[PDB]
Amino acid sequence: HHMLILTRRVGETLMVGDDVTVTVLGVKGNQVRIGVNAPKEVAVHREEIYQRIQKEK
Amino acid sequence: HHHMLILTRRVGETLMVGDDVTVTVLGVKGNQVRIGVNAPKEVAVHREEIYQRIQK
């Protein structure tokens, strides 16, 4: 394993497995707006929220 | 059943998908966003337009 590195332009989508999609919705400066679709049972978090959740579990 | 989420990430910032996948913004050039995905060997990662072609 290692990290996979690709370009996605505004409007383009990457898929993690068969059931999760991650779409680039927009870019302003160093900011990317991102849309995620996923199964209800699959949690999606900003890292900072994910790590707080992990410390509480 | 599904849920949807819209968020903002700056270059260097990361979102987690479940417990075993992360997607990180590595760079921005115009409308192009460079992204890094870490995921288990057993979890395929596709560009959707390529995956849609494979499906035919």
UniProtKB/Swiss-Prot annotation, chain A:
Record-linked Gene3D superfamilies: Translational regulator CsrA
Protein purpose: A key translational regulator that binds mRNA to regulate translation initiation and/or mRNA stability. Mediates global changes in gene expression, shifting from rapid growth to stress survival by linking envelope stress, the stringent response and the catabolite repression systems. Usually binds in the 5'-UTR; binding at or near the Shine-Dalgarno sequence prevents ribosome-binding, repressing translation, binding elsewhere in the 5'-UTR can activate translation and/or stabilize the mRNA. Its function is antagonized by small RNA(s). Binds to mRNA to regulate gene activity at a post-transcriptional level. Represses expression of many toxic extracellular enzymes and compounds; decreases translation of lasI and rhlI. Positively controls swarming motility and rhanolipid and lipase, possibly via expression of rhlA; activates transcription of the CsrA/RsmA antagonistic sRNA RsmZ.
Native organism: Pseudomonas aeruginosa (strain ATCC 15692 / DSM 22644 / CIP 104116 / JCM 14847 / LMG 12228 / 1C / PRS 101 / PAO1)
Signal peptide: none
Cell compartment(s), UniProt: Cytoplasm
GO BP annotations listed: mRNA catabolic process; negative regulation of translational initiation; positive regulation of translational initiation; protein secretion by the type III secretion system; protein secretion by the type VI secretion system; quorum sensing; regulation of carbohydrate metabolic process; regulation of secondary metabolic process
Pfam family, one: CsrA
HAMAP family: CsrA
Induction: Low levels of expression in early log phase, increases about 3-fold by stationary phase (at protein level).
Protein name: Translational regulator CsrA
Keyword field: Activator, Cytoplasm, Repressor, RNA-binding, Translation regulation
GO CC terms: cytosol
Gene ablation phenotype (knockout): Grows slightly more slowly; 30% reduction in staphylolytic activity, increased production of lectin PA-IL, blue-green pigment pyocyanine and HCN. Increases levels of autoinducers 3-oxo-C12-HSL (3-oxo-N-(tetrahydro-2-oxo-3-furanyl)-dodecanamide) and C4-HSL (N-butanoylhomoserine lactone) in early log phase which becomes nearly wild-type (3-oxo-C12-HSL) or 2-fold greater (C4-HSL) by late log phase. Loss of swarming mobility and rhamnolipid production, loss of sRNA RsmZ expression, decreased lipase, increases synthesis of pyocyanine and HCN.
Statement: the UniProt record of this protein carries the keyword Transmembrane: no
Domain of life: Bacteria
Subunit structure, as described in the record: Homodimer; the beta-strands of each monomer intercalate to form a hydrophobic core while the alpha-helices form wings that extend away from the core.
Family of the protein in this entry: Belongs to the CsrA/RsmA family.
Coiled-coil annotated residue ranges, if any: none
Molecular function in Gene Ontology: mRNA 5'-UTR binding
First-listed, main subcellular location of the protein, grouped into a coarse class: cytoplasm
